C-alpha cells in the first residue's frame, strides 16, 4: 500500500531522469532542489537547455 515518499519521489525521480549531466548528482542535491515549496529559486527561465 505504501509506495511513495510524500510527493518528492516522483519529482526527484523525474528531475534525475532529465538531468543532461554526466557525473555524480548526489541525492542530497535532488532532495534540496525538489523540496523547496516556498521559493522558486530553482525554477527559472532557461534559454539554453542542451549541452554546448
Amino acid at each position: 500500500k505504501s509506495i511513495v515518499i510524500t510527493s518528492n519521489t516522483v519529482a526527484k525521480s523525474e528531475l534525475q531522469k532529465s538531468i543532461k549531466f554526466s557525473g555524480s548528482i548526489p541525492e542530497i542535491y535532488l532532495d534540496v532542489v525538489t523540496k523547496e515549496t516556498i521559493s522558486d529559486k530553482y525554477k527559472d527561465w532557461h534559454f539554453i537547455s542542451k549541452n554546448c
Binding site: 500500500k1 505504501s2 510524500t6 515549496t37 516556498i38
Partner: protein, 48 residues
C-alpha cells in the same frame, strides 16, 4: 477455518486502519514541517 478466516478479516481491517493512521500522521508531519520552515523564515525576517 472459520476462526482463521475471521482472523484474516480482523487482520486486514487492522492493516487498513493502520495505513489510514500512517497516512494521516505522515500528512500532518509534512504539513507541520513546511509550516515550521515558513514560520522560521517569517520570524527571522520580523526579528531582523
Amino acid at each position: 477455518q472459520e476462526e482463521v478466516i475471521a482472523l484474516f478479516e480482523k487482520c486486514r481491517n487492522k492493516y487498513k486502519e493502520g495505513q489510514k493512521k500512517y497516512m494521516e500522521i505522515d500528512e500532518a508531519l509534512n504539513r507541520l514541517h513546511n509550516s515550521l520552515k515558513a514560520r522560521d523564515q517569517n520570524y527571522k525576517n520580523a526579528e531582523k
